[PDB]
Design brief:
Chains A, B, C, D: This is Aquaporin-1. Chains A, B, C, D: Belongs to the MIP/aquaporin (TC 1.A.8) family. The structure is a homotetramer. By secondary structure, chain A is an all-alpha fold. Chain A has a single domain (about 1-224), classed as Up-down Bundle (Glycerol uptake facilitator protein), CATH 1.20.1080. The first copy, chain A, is built from nine helices and no strands. Chain A has helices at about 5-25, 40-55, 70-80, 90-105, 105-110, 130-150, 165-175, 185-195, 205-220. In chain A, α1 packs across α4 (about 90-105). The longest helix of chain A has 22 residues, at about 5-25. At the A-B interface, α6 and α7 of A face α1, α2 and α5 of B.
Chain lengths: ~220, ~220, ~220, ~220
């Protein structure tokens, strides 16, 4: 266990990153002409949410299933009041995120035309002021898992860890609208690592910090 | 509590309005040319249904999850026979609806081309006679939550408040067909408040009143 | 009760027929030019499956939720061996189906261009030999509800009557491919009643009879 | 029973193959011109996942619902350590797969234009090196059912065999991207049997063997 959840965690994210990119890039590949699809990226949404549940994150992990950066942090902070010690799973997550973005490459990059661009760069058209969207989309999932963990004795009766996989699935469909491609950090860090140009602004990282911070203050406005 | 459910309620709708508009307007934004999508508004459907469930409307609220105007009223009326006192949650809802439409603006409006048109105006092509559709789509959700609250001991066994989020999700896909954009009141009031032209006819508000009234009379045709 | 389930049943189908047609016709309505969509009819699928569940078919009805013609019959036959008396719900269903197709008209027909064509006529391109598809799609739902009613003590644990609403939702997406528009009888009878041309061949009705007959013989190949 | 699960198994796959092909080919059929759709094959995903659940694979079968080749094997191997005897269900599956691809033909082939091409041949553009994708998509389902069977006492509470039907539904949407059409063996064997050209490379069969082998080694990295 002194390393197990971490490896298992690194394992998940890894495939998730390959899953997402597979779907995102997949478009226009043969020696044909442009087509451009919008229902593809919405597919990325679901897929990513499924790979998460497919983890069997029961014993193999801890009460929280797969957790992307911003989320990872968001939960451990609101879950830790009396004290402030639980960064391990965070470090674990980021690490696993890095490797995930390492394996992503593969044949995809070899067979692509000069200009692939694995991910966004300036998302749509808006100066460093159009970062409000991603902020709201971040408290969604953050709040989805928060709510899911809190309310219990009087909610439903049991279903399956798809709940989050579908909610994050939609936040994605809302964020990837035309600007803000790359909700959480991970997905974008590994994008700017290989075949990049650097000018990520990590604007998307400064978002969730305020967002996840906002969804934590809002959830405290309930009980204790 | 002498204000809590109201704030919590105002809170929900708020984000929901930003969620919906985000998805609806999101289309054609860059300095590119027309494209026009129809699978986008269907996305609005789901998204809106998710933000509702994401509320954890257990203790934080009362047995009914988020409730849009027409619905809000529809339930409290059929739930209240012996007497007629339970308008508070209604006032609460409308209020929260107003603020929701206030925050909607944001960067969206600043970066849009002169003619945005946040929402419908005369929905498709039909005089003040083409309001039957929205009426039927309104008793759907109204009846979804009504049925969900009534039948219990012999129904299923427990799932999650997505049920309504998917049913309303489809009513939307049926209403937003080409005419009647803006099922419930809320979404349209806040639309005609900022950057408008006034000629909403609130036709959509005169609908649900008859619709929700119809689904209440039809549900009485069962037990008591 | 000497009429209740029947009225309640007539009630359901009614709205379902209006729901479906609303979605099917909805396309290309304004004074614009052609566009033709294929993701719309797939919407019809889900919608129809939802209106079914929205029935609260517990006490108000009997163990089988809404049931379209071919299905209606299919269940009562396999459910009745020792004897052969349970046609009442069948007559009920067809009747309710007729009224459903009566109200369908409305504004839709008034504002449409000469050539609406509420439904199929010769579905795609194939003589009276291309009826195998609809046959297979019919045993799907028929078998969905059959299986759902049989296996119990060792299956899941309880969910919601969406199961059928999604399975029929897909059979539809498979049938309405390009030929065989109008899975069960109902939907097509009411189509050829108003603004028709008569040449339905009811081929779709001769299908399910063999189909539902086939799925009944196949389910007997299990226990007893 | 000395033949029952096998017939029942042959039965399932059969319809599944007809289901899938129905959806895949369905596009561009009338005497009209090209259109080419991408949201159709994603429909194949779900449909296939539904026909599986529709099996009522409780007593009629064994703990594993329908199981396609690669999967069939993948489970029986990880389920059998102490010994190595449980190939019967495997032989059964492949057999049923063969007949499934026999009935697939039908009217479809008679009314199609010379060049139908029931399935892929060289999937997209990539030498015998672009087989990594299908490998990853294979451990998905393989791992979905593996995880679903393992973790129990602390997971959810009961739902329905759609879980796999939706996960495989997405793996499909990820694989059928543009290359690797035909996830598991079955679907492709029966494709190269009727109206073929032979040059399948079964590359897709050499994949899952490594994939399913990989997902078995990864799941052992947990408990025992």
């Amino acid at each position: 266990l002194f390393w197990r959840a971490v490896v298992a965690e690194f394992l998940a994210t890894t495939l998730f990153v390959f899953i997402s990119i597979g779907s995102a890039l997949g478009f226009k590949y043969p020696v044909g002409n442009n087509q451009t699809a919008v229902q593809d990226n919405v597919k990325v949404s679901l897929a990513f949410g499924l790979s998460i549940a497919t983890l069997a994150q029961s014993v193999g992990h801890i009460s929280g299933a797969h957790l992307n950066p911003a989320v990872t942090l968001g939960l451990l902070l609101s879950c830790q009041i009396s004290i402030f010690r639980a960064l391990m799973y965070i470090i674990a997550q980021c690490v696993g995120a890095i490797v995930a973005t390492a394996i992503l490459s593969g044949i995809t990059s070899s067979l692509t035309g000069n200009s692939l661009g694995r991910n966004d760069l300036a998302d749509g058209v808006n100066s460093g002021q159009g970062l409000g969207i991603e902020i709201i989309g971040t408290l969604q999932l953050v709040l989805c898992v928060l709510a899911t963990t809190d309310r219990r004795r009087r909610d439903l009766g049991g279903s399956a860890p798809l709940a989050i996989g579908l909610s994050v699935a939609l936040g994605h469909l809302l964020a990837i609208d035309y600007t803000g491609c790359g909700i959480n950090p991970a997905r974008s860090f590994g994008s700017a690592v290989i075949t990049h140009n650097f000018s990520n602004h990590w604007i998307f990282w400064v978002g969730p910090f305020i967002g996840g911070a906002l969804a934590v203050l809002i959830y405290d406005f309930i009980l204790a």
